[PDB]
């Protein structure tokens, strides 16, 4: 089967995590409140009434967790820095204890021969910026994020050589500002009554625009002041479902392409070509911001690599609607498509625990080829890929460890990835499994177990290896 030999020399294997989902210690060492602290402590927002105040306590347990990575022979660990641990109020006074913590984490990883791949922003905006100017909705976020990024480059970039500025800006724009299912939970209240404020037709495009500009501002700083002496690289992690046409007809083929342009192209077309996709300009019109000439010049080419967070593939059909007033405008209607994991009464594949996560290994290879062809073969890392078990209190821990479905998922998606590189010529440089440990899965709380290690929430967060731990250890053998 698969071995390191199935991938290019030097191909990087790792696991991925995110600060708010893993760290806990939410009030420790001067940490500022974030929009997710506020959101997880608001009624109705988290399905199982939980929060990540303690999470899996990686803030105190990182050395134990690093040994768990080393036990499998991982090359790398993707983690995020909590902005509010560095600047508790977003800007202003730096929190030395935050710098000190992440230095300890980085040094502990390197002491075990594990390379740090660091995400600057994994959704945990300091609440002080949300309060001051509504965070990503205001242009001020661009300069504030860039200053925060600069502090990280300055403090950590002598050791950190792979930076991911932003995690899934598409997810944040849609879930935070169209559906209102993730922090800050804004949307058109006429579409979804649970939201307090927002506009599903306009706010997602503003937020996305500011993410793109924020990346380019940090990248400009990195390139001008840090990159020559640090010799590192910067990218972004895009959430990308693969889309297949719901029928092999010209109208549904164009629909799947359009759905992809509204998902990945929304962000990637600016970074490679200096403007949004034409289809978005045509359909979103004046609700889609325009780059200035000077902005386009800083935005185009601002990525060193493309991070791809990929789980699943849906079918996409053309959709005709031409009335939502303005009052019901939303991003899905804007696409002119509907995407679903069902065709002619049949699901596209087996499903993991998450209701959205269909197991479709071929989509990994199809997406690698799409990125290669559309964007002229940029370097790509799979910055997130994996699947979840339920959190099932009616079975024993021993039965919860038998994650044969996860093994087959990683086997099949990795086989497809290996082929995209070897047969198709895709420039993929590494792969990061979501996730090292079971953790707090945003609005799903503790109901979803994505970990290679099982976490016993009822026994002081004890970590147990699922079967997939041995499978990865065997894969990564030298």
* Residues at the contact surface with ligand GLC, assessed by CB under 6 A: 18, 21, 167-168, 309, 384, 434, 441, 450
Closest by CA position to 274, among listed 297, 240, 254: 297
* Residue 9: how many other CB atoms lie within 10 Å: 6
Q: How far apart are CA 257 and CA 273, in angstroms?
A: 17
Q: How far apart are CA 133 and CA 228, in angstroms?
A: 35
Tell me whether residue 167 or residue 200 sits nearer to ligand GLC (CB atom). Answer: 167
Tokens of 345: 């009464």
Q: How far apart are CA 438 and CA 450, in angstroms?
A: 5
Q: How far apart are CA 463 and CA 456, in angstroms?
A: 7
Tell me whether residue 69 or residue 99 sits nearer to ligand GLC (CB atom). Answer: 69
CB 186 within 8 A of CB 141: no
At its nearest, how many Å lie between ligand GLC and the CB of residue 264? Answer: 15
At its nearest, how many Å lie between ligand GLC and the CB of residue 21? Answer: 6
Tell me whether residue 381 or residue 450 sits nearer to ligand GLC (CB atom). Answer: 450
Tell me whether residue 99 or residue 360 sits nearer to ligand GLC (CB atom). Answer: 360
At its nearest, how many Å lie between ligand GLC and the CB of residue 167? Answer: 5
Tokens of 198: 């927002």
Tell me whether residue 334 or residue 384 sits nearer to ligand GLC (CB atom). Answer: 384
* Residue 261: how many other CB atoms lie within 10 Å: 21
Torsion over CA: 459, 461, 467, 469 (sign)? negative
- CA Rg value for the chain: 21
Tell me whether residue 276 or residue 450 sits nearer to ligand GLC (CB atom). Answer: 450
Which residue pairs from 269-273 have beta carbons closer than 8 angstroms and sit at least 24 positions apart in sequence?
Answer: 270/212, 270/296, 270/299, 270/300, 271/212, 271/215, 271/236, 271/299, 271/300, 271/301, 271/302, 271/303, 272/300, 272/301, 272/303, 272/374, 272/375, 272/376, 272/378, 273/300
Tell me whether residue 239 or residue 261 sits nearer to ligand GLC (CB atom). Answer: 239
Tell me whether residue 7 or residue 434 sits nearer to ligand GLC (CB atom). Answer: 434
CB 122 within 8 A of CB 19: yes
CB 434 within 8 A of CB 167: no
Closest by CA position to 296, among listed 205, 203, 212: 212
At its nearest, how many Å lie between ligand GLC and the CB of residue 292? Answer: 31
DSSP-derived pairing of the beta strands 337-340 and 242-245: unpaired
Tell me whether residue 258 or residue 310 sits nearer to ligand GLC (CB atom). Answer: 310
Tell me whether residue 21 or residue 34 sits nearer to ligand GLC (CB atom). Answer: 21
Task: Mention every residue, 6+ apart, whose C-beta is less than 8 A from residue 223.
Answer: none
Q: How far apart are CA 44 and CA 52, in angstroms?
A: 15
CB 228 within 8 A of CB 306: no
At its nearest, how many Å lie between ligand GLC and the CB of residue 45? Answer: 16
At its nearest, how many Å lie between ligand GLC and the CB of residue 406? Answer: 13
At its nearest, how many Å lie between ligand GLC and the CB of residue 156? Answer: 21
At its nearest, how many Å lie between ligand GLC and the CB of residue 131? Answer: 24
Tell me whether residue 106 or residue 308 sits nearer to ligand GLC (CB atom). Answer: 308
At its nearest, how many Å lie between ligand GLC and the CB of residue 235? Answer: 14
At its nearest, how many Å lie between ligand GLC and the CB of residue 444? Answer: 8
At its nearest, how many Å lie between ligand GLC and the CB of residue 233? Answer: 20
Closest by CA position to 167, among listed 20, 313, 383, 332: 383
């Amino acid at each position: 089967g698969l071995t390191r030999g199935s991938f290019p020399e030097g191909f990087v294997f790792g696991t991925a995590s995110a600060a708010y989902q893993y760290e806990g210690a939410v009030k420790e060492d001067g940490r500022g409140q974030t929009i997710w602290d506020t959101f997880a402590h608001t009624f109705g927002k988290i399905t199982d009434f939980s929060n990540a105040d303690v999470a899996v306590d990686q803030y105190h347990r990182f050395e134990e967790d690093i040994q768990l990575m080393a036990d499998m022979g991982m090359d790398a660990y993707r983690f995020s820095i909590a902005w509010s641990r560095i600047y508790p109020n977003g800007v202003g006074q730096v929190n030395q204890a935050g710098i000190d913590h992440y230095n300890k984490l980085i040094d502990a990883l390197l002491a075990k021969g594990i390379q740090p791949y660091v995400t600057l922003y994994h959704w945990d905006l300091p609440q002080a910026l949300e309060d001051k100017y509504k965070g990503w909705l205001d242009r001020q976020i661009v300069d504030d994020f860039a200053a925060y990024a600069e502090t990280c480059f300055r403090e950590f970039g002598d050791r950190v050589k792979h930076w991911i500025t932003l995690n899934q800006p598409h997810t944040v724009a849609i879930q935070g500002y169209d559906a209102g299912l993730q922090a800050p939970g804004r949307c058109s209240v006429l579409l979804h009554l649970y939201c307090k404020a927002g506009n599903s037709g306009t706010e997602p495009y503003v937020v996305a625009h500011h993410f793109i500009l924020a990346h380019a501002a940090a990248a400009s700083i990195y390139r001008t002041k840090y990159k020559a002496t640090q010799n590192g690289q910067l990218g972004i992690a895009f959430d990308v479902m693969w889309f297949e046409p719901m029928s092999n007809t010209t109208i549904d083929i164009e629909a799947a392409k359009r759905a992809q342009e509204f998902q990945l192209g929304w962000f990637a077309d600016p970074f490679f070509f200096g403007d949004y996709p034409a289809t978005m300009r045509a359909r979103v019109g004046e609700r889609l911001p325009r780059f200035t000439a000077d902005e386009a010049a800083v935005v185009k080419g601002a990525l060193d690599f493309v991070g791809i967070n990929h789980y699943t593939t849906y079918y996409t059909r053309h959709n005709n609607t031409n009335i939502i007033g303005t009052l019901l405008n939303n991003t899905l209607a804007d696409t002119g498509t509907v995407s679903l994991p069902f065709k002619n009464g049949k699901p596209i594949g087996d499903r993991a625990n998450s209701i959205w996560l269909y197991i479709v290994p071929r989509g990994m290879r199809s997406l690698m080829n799409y990125v290669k062809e559309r964007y002229n073969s940029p370097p790509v890392y799979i910055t997130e890929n994996g699947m979840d078990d339920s959190n099932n209190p009616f079975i024993s821990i021993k039965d919860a460890l038998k994650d044969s479905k996860r093994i087959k998922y990683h086997n099949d998606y990795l086989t497809n990835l290996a082929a995209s590189i070897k047969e198709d010529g895709c420039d993929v440089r590494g792969y990061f499994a979501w996730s090292l440990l079971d953790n707090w899965e945003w609005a799903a709380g503790y109901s979803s177990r994505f970990g290679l290690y099982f976490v016993d929430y009822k026994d002081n967060l004890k970590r147990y290896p699922k079967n997939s731990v041995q499978w990865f250890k065997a894969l990564l053998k030298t």
